[PDB]
Symmetry: none
Subunit: 146 residues, 4 copies
């Protein structure tokens, strides 16, 4: 198992093809929008380019993403929301926000009232915001070998 | 992770030359012209490949499916040139006992100077090595 | 056979673009011109690579040997742009505690707007991000 | 170990580069001469092209080689000899002829007398012959990745 991890990784890293203007990171391609849209229109905007409003699965991915948005100083949408409006945050892929990720919300975040059910990268952490607000968005999709 | 590694490998290394078909790690070339068995052998060597040597039942099945869309007869890397009823692949290996099942009904033959194998949609036939047939070349798929 | 597999892998996948140097699975590009830190970052992205992020002690050593033949100063994918004394690689990862040893004596600094790291023959120095330096790009070696 | 063997093999098979006119087989390149020379001159002739008078290491290699020489109906030298003239056959790489390979000699082969201390592929098996005789020869060298 010692080598398997290394080799497996070294191998998966060879398939790193991403579209033009997209950035590669650990097996996936990321797209930083050039315009702004509300949450819902961002969810569909990503599907149009065969991607998905970014669903964060590891702490390393979260670090990469936060660095990207802060580099351009833009507030960006992520595929996380609580549309049932009851403290249950879920990723657009259907998975639930794991306990170990609550650490990423900025102090005071999230909030039960105010009709703010969409997560965004805001400053050095996460903020919940009105889904109708206009923000940049980040798309994510598997990297290809060709 | 062992299996996941193969998936990565299987995913990355599946590059085949233009007009060759990929299948389980290899590239297969169905010719666009016919030649006798010996010239088919050199034809494959010229493209750094080998007149197809069948190693698995799946490959045999795949080649049958490919062949079925045209109903061709193709030379394969199998022969009994010394006429001993001793069939060998061009890589020197003997036709194992478990692969003898692939001969079509009535094949092979210990008579008629039919010392070469041809691949059809239902199995193998033995035939005169000088006959003109299409051929099938085989070589490993690449990674880039 | 595990190790023997790597040897095969290590042997086959060591292809690097023209003018890049291969080292333990990766390709390194020592620039032929200078730019500021941000333009160096985009310069690497333009060639499907990344301003070098150092992951092992061996790589650090290798880059020092490479650098020593010219005594250059090169931008590396490390910065503290928010000026927190919090250094991060361009892939988002924090400078681990065990890699802090590579800073040259007297580096880094919590003053002087020197928020970018430059690679020298003896270690790292922090410097104004607008200064013009050569740069080092990194990306995986290929198999063909 | 089950997969390791498959994968390892599938991988080694990707480095199959051989010179012009040389034939590839299981990780190595083989050259069938176009002229004839005695044994000793064949040993050096192969070194000139960065190879070695073929040293057979497996039964599968032996089958491949025997098929090659019989295809052209040529008697060919191999890197096997008993120059000490005392029933001790050794490969040019210094390794000894293993017990399980004695099966390849043609009936009656080898012989203690007659000054025949060099092995050749003769017919469907091996023959020992006078080293000064002219035969075709087969060179062998590792296959490259480039
Ligand atoms: Na909320
Ligand atoms: Na909020
Ligand atoms: Na026959
Ligand atoms: Na027949
Ligand atoms: Na500083
Ligand atoms: Na400094
Ligand atoms: Na003898
Ligand atoms: Na003899």
């Amino acid at each position: 198992y010692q080598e398997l991890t290394d080799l497996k990784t070294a191998f998966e890293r060879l398939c790193r093809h991403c579209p033009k203007d997209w950035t590669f990171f650990q097996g996936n391609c990321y797209f930083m929008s050039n315009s702004q849209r509300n949450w819902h229109d961002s969810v569909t905007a990503c599907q149009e380019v065969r991607a998905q409003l970014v669903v964060i699965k590891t702490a390393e991915e979260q670090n990469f993403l936060q660095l990207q948005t802060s580099r351009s100083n833009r507030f960006s949408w992520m595929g996380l929301s609580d549309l049932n409006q009851e403290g249950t945050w879920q990723w657009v892929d259907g998975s639930p926000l794991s306990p170990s990720f609550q650490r990423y919300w900025n102090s005071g975040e999230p909030n039960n009232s105010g009709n703010e059910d969409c997560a965004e990268f805001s400053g050095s952490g996460w903020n919940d915001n009105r889904c109708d607000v206009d923000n940049y968005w980040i798309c994510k999709k598997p990297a290809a070998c060709f």
